[PDB]
From a paper:
Intimin, an out membrane protein expressed by EHEC and EPEC, is required for intimate attachment to the host cell and formation of the A/E lesions. The binding of intimin to Tir mediates the adhesion between the pathogen and its host cell. The intimin of EHEC O157:H7 is of γ-type (designated intimin-γ), whereas that of EPEC is intimin-α.
In this study, we solved the structure of EHEC Int188 and its mutant IntN916Y. R-free values were separately refined to 29.6% and 26.8%. These two versions of intimin (Int188 and IntN916Y) were crystallized in space group C2 and P212121, respectively. For the native version, Int188 consists of four molecules in the asymmetric unit while the IntN916Y is present in two molecules per asymmetric unit. Recent study have demonstrated that four important residues (S890, T909, N916 and N927) of EHEC intimin are essential for Tir recognition. Int188 and IntN916Y behave completely the same at the level of higher structure (not shown).
Author numbering: 747 to 934
Write the structure that this text describes.
Amino acid sequence: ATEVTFFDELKIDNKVDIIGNNVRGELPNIWLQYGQFKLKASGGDGTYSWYSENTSIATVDASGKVTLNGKGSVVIKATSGDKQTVSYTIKAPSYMIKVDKQAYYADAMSICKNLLPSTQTVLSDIYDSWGAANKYSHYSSMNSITAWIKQTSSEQRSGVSSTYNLITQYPLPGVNVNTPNVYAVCVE
């Protein structure tokens, strides 16, 4: 006959831990596909288990680390050992960035069905919200991710287009359309 413990009500912290930049704040409105973050649970008996109501949109492991997989809204549930369950909802993003294979500008256009990032900000804003792409499991191997930017009217005339690197923040204008080592990043 030992003594009993008492717990507070289970609560999922609204403050999210973004793996890429060590930021503790709400989930970014704009998404990097396969970006990751740690949901912080509290209360209960300290032991939790996580569940996704839709893997197509997002997945979650045993540590609370959530991986974004698709554009949309999904509910994540945390269950403490003492039989408490709490919901945390993921609001769909304004847009999400996808990284396909490397290609020339023209090909990248068709690949992304003409949904290449409209400006450098579309891409740089994602770095500000998530940080270096390779800090995430899905991109760990890569050291550089150069992405096409939608070429301006003048750029289309000269056969070039500027680029932005999702890891190095490196901007680069006047890149010939038929340049290798450039990823087709679809903005959806």
